């Protein structure tokens, strides 16, 4: 009995779409005075409750809320950052102005078709499970399959995150099984904490590097 | 009362999204034809958007009302002329008109390069709603001033007409939008209205 969007839910989603259009129109008018060199977009997905909203919020604002406010379908956050390409000496190259649009999808099945419609906008994916929830780790293969059927290129860039690493007493997912899974699919893996920020920026910067590197292959 | 999204509704929508991803990936791999042109049909539920596209792609019409489950699209390979013919692969998005799908369908406005906007010549409320639909397009399109072709559909139902041609021509004139009176049942002006939209979209990208 998945229920249809209430008009309050629908108002909230239409306002996200309204914000996204303003953003894309500013980018259409030679957007790529605070301006930038590229609008980079990616998308966070994974089961409900794993920490997708908290991870993006920790990354953009350095803050964390204990209270669970499940996401009404779709949202996004933004961050201006400076990206520097890598070479035989680390982050060697010139600093590029990157405007990040960080899509945040609801994890509950009831929003599956709404959220999948935004894969077309994503250049990369941040895939999360919860180190304290074995079911959310087991669903990772399904999520990856969904990404390969629904992304809008063929081998989409993904970074896997096992989140809530600060809850060490409640950990149930074994490190070797997760590392093996990421190894099997060739995707980078980070254990993260939205609560204290551990590996948040590293995981997102790796995804950003992957997308920039792919883009320079053209 | 409380009503629900069925798993069959969501499965059908996911299959459209799967088909759309497969198509864009095929266009990525040197996608044959010369351009993938996308446009989108919208308007109140029941005005005939699904019927109009089906008449255009297949030359057929179904009397029975099967409301669209959120989104679908059809495809057509056509030849466009500004010899002078270019091979165009058309993606024809078909949105559900009912409010319950407003957010799903609005997410696809950005994928469109032009819009086929419909009302029902026999439903005055659907003509009055045209202004609002134009607002949503301006607010959510790719493109501040998006190409729109307006269609007053069901012209074959002349004895149930309630929208006067002059009122409709006047509305379209206030916006600078081409207007066609169409029939999905017998095909009248269908191909003309879509070719007009295509021409607006082709001419616009050639201004580059
Ligand atoms: N201790 C701890 N709690 C976390 C962490 N990440 C999220 N949480 C908590 O777990 C709950 C769910 O997090 P939330 O970010 O909303 O998850 P979500 O992936 O967005 N869920 P949904 O898909 O329903 O929107 C919240 O109470 C949040 O505070 C983390 O790294 N550590
Ligand atoms: N006589 C006549 N009937 C038409 C015409 N166009 C559509 N219809 C009929 O009107 C009904 C609604 O058509 P349909 O294409 O399903 O409309 P829709 O705009 O796609 N509805 P929705 O937004 O709910 O998916 C159907 O019974 C269809 O046969 C037309 O030009 N003439
Ligand atoms: C998954 C397709 C891809 O490789 N890149 C991509 N994804 C996009 C989503 C929306 C708009 C544009 C998109 N691109 C093209 C830009 C790009 C190309 C290579 C690497 C990164 N980004
Ligand atoms: C402003 C004209 C317009 O709508 N362009 C548009 N719409 C797109 C939707 C999806 C992908 C790319 C799109 N573009 C840019 C290409 C284009 C197409 C037709 C006319 C002008 N530009
Ligand atoms: Mg969330
Ligand atoms: Mg329909």
Residue numbers in the entry:
A (entry chain A): -37 to -6, 3 to 188
B (entry chain B): -37 to -7, 5 to 55, 63 to 188
What does the literature reporting this entry say, word for word?
Rab27A and Rab27B are secretory Rabs with well-characterised roles in transport and docking of secretory vesicles (exosomes) at the plasma membrane. Rab27A promotes the growth and invasion of multiple cancer types such as breast, lung and pancreatic, by enhancing secretion of chemokines, metalloproteases and exosomes. Reported co-crystal structures show that several effectors of Rab27A interact with the Rab27A SF4 pocket (‘WF-binding pocket’) via a conserved tryptophan–phenylalanine (WF) dipeptide motif. To obtain structural insight into the ligandability of this pocket, a novel construct was designed fusing Rab27A to part of an effector protein (fRab27A), allowing crystallisation of Rab27A in high throughput.
Covalent ligands are increasingly used to target challenging proteins. fRab27A contains two cysteine residues (C123 and C188) in close proximity to the WF-binding pocket, which are mutated to serine in crystal structures. Sequence alignment of Rab27A and Rab27B against the Rab family demonstrated that these two cysteine residues are unique to Rab27 among other family members, suggesting that cysteine-reactive covalent fragments targeting the WF binding site may offer a means to ligand Rab27 selectively over other Rabs. Compounds A01 and B01 were confirmed as hits against fRab27A-C188 and fRab27A-C123, respectively. Residues K11 and D91 were located in close proximity to the methyl ether moiety, suggesting a route to build further polar contacts in analogues of A01. However, in contrast to the fRab27A-C188-A01 structures, in which the SF4 pocket is largely unperturbed by C188 modification, and the Rab27A-Slp2a complex, C123 modification by B01 caused the side chain of Y122 to adopt an alternate conformation, opening up an enlarged cavity in the pocket. Interestingly, molecular dynamic simulations on Rab27A (PDB: 3 BC1, chain A) suggested that the Y122 sidechain has three main rotamers with the rotamer trapped by the fRab27A-C123-B01 complex as the preferred conformation.
